[PDB]
Amino acid sequence: IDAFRLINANMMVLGHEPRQTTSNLGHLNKPSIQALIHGLNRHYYSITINYRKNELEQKMLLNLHKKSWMEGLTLQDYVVKEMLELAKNYNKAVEEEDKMTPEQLAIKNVGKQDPKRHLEEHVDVLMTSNIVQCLAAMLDTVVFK
Amino acid sequence: TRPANHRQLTFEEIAKSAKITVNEVELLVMKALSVGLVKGSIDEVDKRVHMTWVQPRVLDLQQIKGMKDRLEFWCTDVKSMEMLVEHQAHDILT
Amino acid sequence: AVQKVVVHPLVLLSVVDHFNRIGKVGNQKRVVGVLLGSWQKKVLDVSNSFAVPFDEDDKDDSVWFLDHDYLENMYGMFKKVNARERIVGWYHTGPKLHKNDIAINELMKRYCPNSVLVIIDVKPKDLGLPTEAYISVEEVHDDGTPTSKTFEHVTSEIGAEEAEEVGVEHLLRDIKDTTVGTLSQRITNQVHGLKGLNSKLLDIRSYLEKVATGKLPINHQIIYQLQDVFNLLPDVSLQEFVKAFYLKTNDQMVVVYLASLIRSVVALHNLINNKIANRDAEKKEG
Amino acid sequence: DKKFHGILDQGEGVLIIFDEPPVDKTYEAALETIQNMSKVVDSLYNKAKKLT
Amino acid sequence: LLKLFTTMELMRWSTLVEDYGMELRKGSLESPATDVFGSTEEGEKRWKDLKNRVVEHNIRIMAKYYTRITMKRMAQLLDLSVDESEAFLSNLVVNKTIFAKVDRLAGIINFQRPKDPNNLLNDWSQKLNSLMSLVNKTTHLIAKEEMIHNLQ
Amino acid sequence: QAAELFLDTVSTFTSYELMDYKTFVTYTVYVSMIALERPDLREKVIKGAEILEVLHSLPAVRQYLFSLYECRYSVFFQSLAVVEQEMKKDWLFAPHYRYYVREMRIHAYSQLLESYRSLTLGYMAEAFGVGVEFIDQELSRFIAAGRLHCKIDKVNEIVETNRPDSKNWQYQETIKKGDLLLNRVQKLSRVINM
């Protein structure tokens, strides 16, 4: 979003420094990077734009935001295990190349720069994915009784 | 009338109360296969007329009242055991 | 045959500032307005709308005000900005209805193949869904009376169309994308368990109040018909799902075998390089 | 010779044919973890080396 | 004819000799009877092709109730012998149009499906057909509930 | 390593180190009757003919191998007993041939057990003779030698084949390593402390 106040050559009698409250045009001054606009420091000084405390709508955008975007009525997910089948074949099929890194840790004395750390991205996928598999295992004894 | 299990029913009440013989219970369901309200998977190594999903009744207003032992049962038991899970899964609120 | 629409909250924010109009113009409590949009499919999008200066007598509730100065020439403006975004229906607040609503639908069914009434929400505290659609229906009865026209519960949703979050997701200023398995699931547990089973308490309000004071729709045509769907599995003592327990051995089979072998792999994940980088950081400090 | 995946009998003399060999859940993950044990053993000399 | 085509209703074959046999007992057109069943070495191929209809079509309708039937009950219900049965087992297993796997170790076999050849699919079908209906529940229970709470 | 190290049989016709090549033929057969798998058996003694002719002069040996491919068991007793008579009378075996024979026999027995499940001993005593109480101490010790995964009954006479890998031990060996290993290098992980 962008906005500008056209100063003119009539007001060059006074200096072009309102300044009266500062750090608002100090933080509007914080970017000051647009190519021909930086150039157009002559004739132009921008205005400050905050966003309004919109909780009279940010409240209801929040309540429709999360009342909407997670399974709606939320009796929808409570797909489960062929995703895991495919995900378990993922989560074995990367495991041999995930375990090439301890071979890549077998430098004996020292011969290596930054460890090339592929430790993660396969911990946590199993972690939250099989949290989903075990509460997914709960959903029979949660839905039924 | 019995909601519970033993839904793999023997033909005994069928051959008794529904005035049919043993050789015709299959027709009694195969014609019902052409009906399609119940679609039972009837045993034929034990001649057991199995009960699957049905079109149950038309009105039992005494069980429109007396459905509480299933409806409120479902309500406070899935809700209460819901709070037993969430009461166990309590201080991971984080 | 309408499952869902796409809802832009832009003109819903015009329902917010017309909700700011009604608090300062006077006696008009409810925000009533007219919904623009275009039928593309069973799925639809609403990109604009407009909120009507409307009055409604409490005595003889069917007194509408949809001015055609306010309709026709504003449809010439709204047509003039875009030929696409024409009418699709209309809206009002409150959860249930309005004795005039049906007539207000028929004023604009001359304008649209299916003028939809989407009853809207200015103050969301709901247990179910947001704003929801109601299509033109003629279900009548098995009776043979004159044709019923009261517009029945035809499912909708709040759809999200396009980018538009240069504003929106900059205006989040609070929220995190959870990698589900990080409490979001128990949020859904509270909302479907709690917000589903208090709707079950609305269903004992149904199946107790209708036993108490409920007339003709006590058992019109869907109560026993969906007492069938209630008779999926309502049984008495413990419902005896004997197939489902060694079937559940086939279930928990998978989850415990994956957790067993795979979390032993996670034991390599955590344990091994935890020790290596551990004791490098420990005794290589000296 | 694996043209015939069944089991014969003499006491009743009843031949029965059935098969389900492949479980890469057991095979792939288990043997990969055996390889993981080998690579941990490959790391134990980085361990015993950083000790002494 | 058309009654035999939808679940066939395991009729007596001699009543099929009544209906299809007394077309030669017609005091009218017998040119249907002569063109179709007045043939002899093609017509008996249509009589036994209609025995192929009783074993073919009636095995097609009895397919619902298997994984549990013996052999002699199958002969009893196919309205024919046990050796006629085993011949029909042979030609309908070289037909192999539905995955037959039979036996005479004690007889309890069938023309059959692949005999539930899967793991966890029972959970999906059972708990995800049933539980995805169960997540359909409240989504239409608000519809019925709000529509009946209009006036009471 | 005996049979694998005897794989060539090409550059070793008769050197000044080889007083008999036929003794070398005995030396490769006496271990290829243990270590050699059955597709490897037909891969060697049937797909390879370069050793066949110098044991074509030893037709009882060749008979014992093709019988070993067939599992006829009386000639196993005969020619295996003859091989045992040689095994007595040949050096570099005397500290070792106690392991030989019965392992030979279980090398026959397992595929015998791979024959089918509910076996009777009389069908076996056809191939065994009086192997009734012979297989009492024989099979009961072979079960008792940690081997010969089965079950046995007297009068209902159940014989068992099983040992489905994807069962427990494939699930076991990794923590068999990673418990003494875990406490081991974990114990090494505390020498840094005190």
mmCIF file of C-alpha atoms in Angstrom, chain E residues 1-150:
data_model
loop_
_atom_site.group_PDB
_atom_site.id
_atom_site.type_symbol
_atom_site.label_atom_id
_atom_site.label_comp_id
_atom_site.label_asym_id
_atom_site.label_seq_id
_atom_site.Cartn_x
_atom_site.Cartn_y
_atom_site.Cartn_z
ATOM 1 C CA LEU E 1 -37.782 -64.358 -19.501
ATOM 2 C CA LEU E 2 -37.456 -60.929 -17.888
ATOM 3 C CA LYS E 3 -38.404 -62.415 -14.513
ATOM 4 C CA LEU E 4 -35.391 -64.746 -14.830
ATOM 5 C CA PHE E 5 -33.066 -61.784 -15.460
ATOM 6 C CA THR E 6 -33.424 -59.916 -12.142
ATOM 7 C CA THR E 7 -32.534 -62.264 -9.203
ATOM 8 C CA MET E 8 -34.260 -65.059 -11.194
ATOM 9 C CA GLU E 9 -36.224 -66.215 -8.146
ATOM 10 C CA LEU E 10 -34.840 -69.801 -8.112
ATOM 11 C CA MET E 11 -37.765 -71.344 -9.944
ATOM 12 C CA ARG E 12 -38.458 -75.001 -10.529
ATOM 13 C CA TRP E 13 -36.813 -76.049 -13.769
ATOM 14 C CA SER E 14 -39.785 -78.237 -14.708
ATOM 15 C CA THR E 15 -42.008 -75.154 -14.418
ATOM 16 C CA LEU E 16 -39.608 -73.661 -16.901
ATOM 17 C CA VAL E 17 -40.449 -76.798 -18.901
ATOM 18 C CA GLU E 18 -44.079 -75.789 -18.316
ATOM 19 C CA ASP E 19 -43.751 -72.210 -19.567
ATOM 20 C CA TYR E 20 -41.109 -72.815 -22.225
ATOM 21 C CA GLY E 21 -42.345 -76.310 -23.039
ATOM 22 C CA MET E 22 -46.026 -75.637 -23.619
ATOM 23 C CA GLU E 23 -45.158 -73.192 -26.384
ATOM 24 C CA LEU E 24 -45.462 -76.365 -28.466
ATOM 25 C CA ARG E 25 -48.899 -76.641 -26.773
ATOM 26 C CA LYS E 26 -49.997 -73.553 -28.699
ATOM 27 C CA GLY E 27 -53.098 -73.445 -30.894
ATOM 28 C CA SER E 28 -51.560 -70.403 -32.570
ATOM 29 C CA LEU E 29 -48.054 -69.378 -33.652
ATOM 30 C CA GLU E 30 -45.604 -72.200 -33.044
ATOM 31 C CA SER E 31 -42.982 -70.577 -35.235
ATOM 32 C CA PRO E 32 -41.463 -69.090 -32.019
ATOM 33 C CA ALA E 33 -41.451 -72.611 -30.539
ATOM 34 C CA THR E 34 -40.093 -74.075 -33.772
ATOM 35 C CA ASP E 35 -37.490 -71.388 -34.508
ATOM 36 C CA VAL E 36 -36.116 -71.400 -30.972
ATOM 37 C CA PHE E 37 -36.867 -74.715 -29.255
ATOM 38 C CA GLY E 38 -38.054 -76.734 -32.241
ATOM 39 C CA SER E 39 -34.392 -77.048 -33.117
ATOM 40 C CA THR E 40 -32.908 -80.314 -31.891
ATOM 41 C CA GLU E 41 -29.104 -80.222 -31.927
ATOM 42 C CA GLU E 42 -29.218 -76.461 -31.516
ATOM 43 C CA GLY E 43 -32.394 -76.455 -29.456
ATOM 44 C CA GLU E 44 -31.033 -78.873 -26.857
ATOM 45 C CA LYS E 45 -28.026 -76.568 -26.798
ATOM 46 C CA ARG E 46 -30.551 -73.904 -25.774
ATOM 47 C CA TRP E 47 -32.146 -76.210 -23.183
ATOM 48 C CA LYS E 48 -28.715 -76.902 -21.684
ATOM 49 C CA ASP E 49 -27.704 -73.318 -22.363
ATOM 50 C CA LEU E 50 -30.675 -72.543 -20.137
ATOM 51 C CA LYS E 51 -29.315 -75.026 -17.632
ATOM 52 C CA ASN E 52 -26.250 -72.859 -18.131
ATOM 53 C CA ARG E 53 -28.621 -70.045 -17.205
ATOM 54 C CA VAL E 54 -29.702 -71.760 -13.989
ATOM 55 C CA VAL E 55 -26.168 -72.477 -12.829
ATOM 56 C CA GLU E 56 -24.692 -69.321 -14.365
ATOM 57 C CA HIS E 57 -27.342 -66.844 -13.306
ATOM 58 C CA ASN E 58 -28.148 -68.564 -10.027
ATOM 59 C CA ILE E 59 -24.485 -68.629 -9.085
ATOM 60 C CA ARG E 60 -24.558 -64.932 -10.004
ATOM 61 C CA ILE E 61 -27.400 -64.345 -7.540
ATOM 62 C CA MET E 62 -26.123 -66.601 -4.758
ATOM 63 C CA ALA E 63 -22.804 -64.694 -4.763
ATOM 64 C CA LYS E 64 -24.102 -62.448 -1.962
ATOM 65 C CA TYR E 65 -24.295 -65.104 0.727
ATOM 66 C CA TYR E 66 -20.999 -66.905 0.361
ATOM 67 C CA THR E 67 -17.719 -67.306 2.281
ATOM 68 C CA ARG E 68 -19.906 -69.805 4.215
ATOM 69 C CA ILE E 69 -21.781 -72.577 2.441
ATOM 70 C CA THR E 70 -21.051 -76.279 2.151
ATOM 71 C CA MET E 71 -21.043 -78.249 -1.087
ATOM 72 C CA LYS E 72 -24.159 -80.416 -0.797
ATOM 73 C CA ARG E 73 -26.265 -77.418 0.197
ATOM 74 C CA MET E 74 -25.014 -75.799 -3.001
ATOM 75 C CA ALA E 75 -26.234 -78.797 -4.992
ATOM 76 C CA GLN E 76 -29.546 -78.639 -3.104
ATOM 77 C CA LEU E 77 -29.946 -74.936 -3.917
ATOM 78 C CA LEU E 78 -28.736 -75.053 -7.519
ATOM 79 C CA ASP E 79 -31.541 -77.616 -8.065
ATOM 80 C CA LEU E 80 -29.157 -80.213 -9.503
ATOM 81 C CA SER E 81 -26.763 -83.025 -8.634
ATOM 82 C CA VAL E 82 -23.340 -83.020 -6.980
ATOM 83 C CA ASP E 83 -21.519 -84.343 -10.046
ATOM 84 C CA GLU E 84 -23.426 -81.943 -12.258
ATOM 85 C CA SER E 85 -22.348 -79.449 -9.586
ATOM 86 C CA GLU E 86 -18.659 -80.334 -9.873
ATOM 87 C CA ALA E 87 -18.834 -80.150 -13.666
ATOM 88 C CA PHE E 88 -20.385 -76.696 -13.251
ATOM 89 C CA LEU E 89 -17.569 -75.903 -10.850
ATOM 90 C CA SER E 90 -15.083 -76.921 -13.534
ATOM 91 C CA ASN E 91 -16.552 -74.967 -16.427
ATOM 92 C CA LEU E 92 -17.297 -71.953 -14.263
ATOM 93 C CA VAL E 93 -13.774 -72.046 -12.844
ATOM 94 C CA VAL E 94 -12.234 -72.137 -16.300
ATOM 95 C CA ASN E 95 -14.729 -69.371 -16.924
ATOM 96 C CA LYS E 96 -13.065 -67.854 -13.778
ATOM 97 C CA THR E 97 -15.273 -64.794 -14.185
ATOM 98 C CA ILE E 98 -15.585 -64.522 -10.391
ATOM 99 C CA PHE E 99 -12.702 -65.797 -8.268
ATOM 100 C CA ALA E 100 -13.717 -69.382 -7.585
ATOM 101 C CA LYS E 101 -11.809 -71.437 -5.058
ATOM 102 C CA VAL E 102 -13.451 -74.732 -4.195
ATOM 103 C CA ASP E 103 -12.620 -77.800 -2.193
ATOM 104 C CA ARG E 104 -13.915 -81.154 -1.025
ATOM 105 C CA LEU E 105 -11.832 -81.483 2.162
ATOM 106 C CA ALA E 106 -15.127 -81.108 3.958
ATOM 107 C CA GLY E 107 -17.064 -79.233 1.258
ATOM 108 C CA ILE E 108 -17.391 -75.760 2.740
ATOM 109 C CA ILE E 109 -16.568 -73.685 -0.344
ATOM 110 C CA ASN E 110 -18.007 -71.421 -2.942
ATOM 111 C CA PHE E 111 -17.737 -69.441 -6.055
ATOM 112 C CA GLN E 112 -16.217 -66.495 -4.373
ATOM 113 C CA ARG E 113 -14.650 -63.017 -4.267
ATOM 114 C CA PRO E 114 -10.908 -62.694 -3.383
ATOM 115 C CA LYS E 115 -11.976 -63.505 0.209
ATOM 116 C CA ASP E 116 -11.371 -60.118 1.882
ATOM 117 C CA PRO E 117 -7.742 -59.893 0.729
ATOM 118 C CA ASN E 118 -6.950 -56.675 2.624
ATOM 119 C CA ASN E 119 -5.871 -55.330 5.990
ATOM 120 C CA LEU E 120 -7.084 -51.970 7.381
ATOM 121 C CA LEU E 121 -9.788 -51.356 4.679
ATOM 122 C CA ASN E 122 -12.174 -52.822 7.266
ATOM 123 C CA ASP E 123 -11.466 -49.784 9.436
ATOM 124 C CA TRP E 124 -12.148 -47.342 6.613
ATOM 125 C CA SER E 125 -15.306 -49.108 5.437
ATOM 126 C CA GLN E 126 -16.466 -49.833 8.989
ATOM 127 C CA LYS E 127 -15.259 -46.759 10.797
ATOM 128 C CA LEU E 128 -14.835 -44.417 7.892
ATOM 129 C CA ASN E 129 -17.953 -45.286 6.008
ATOM 130 C CA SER E 130 -19.731 -45.447 9.366
ATOM 131 C CA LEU E 131 -17.832 -42.614 11.039
ATOM 132 C CA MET E 132 -17.867 -40.407 7.972
ATOM 133 C CA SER E 133 -21.602 -40.914 8.159
ATOM 134 C CA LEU E 134 -21.159 -40.012 11.816
ATOM 135 C CA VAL E 135 -19.536 -36.731 10.799
ATOM 136 C CA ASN E 136 -22.364 -36.269 8.371
ATOM 137 C CA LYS E 137 -24.748 -36.556 11.345
ATOM 138 C CA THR E 138 -24.566 -33.148 13.062
ATOM 139 C CA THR E 139 -24.124 -31.449 9.662
ATOM 140 C CA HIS E 140 -27.649 -32.509 8.791
ATOM 141 C CA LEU E 141 -28.955 -32.600 12.384
ATOM 142 C CA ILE E 142 -28.626 -28.825 12.446
ATOM 143 C CA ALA E 143 -30.743 -28.789 9.271
ATOM 144 C CA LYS E 144 -33.542 -30.943 10.680
ATOM 145 C CA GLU E 145 -33.239 -29.283 14.094
ATOM 146 C CA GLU E 146 -33.442 -25.708 12.806
ATOM 147 C CA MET E 147 -36.218 -26.607 10.396
ATOM 148 C CA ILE E 148 -38.362 -28.202 13.099
ATOM 149 C CA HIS E 149 -37.647 -25.428 15.614
ATOM 150 C CA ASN E 150 -39.367 -22.870 13.354
#
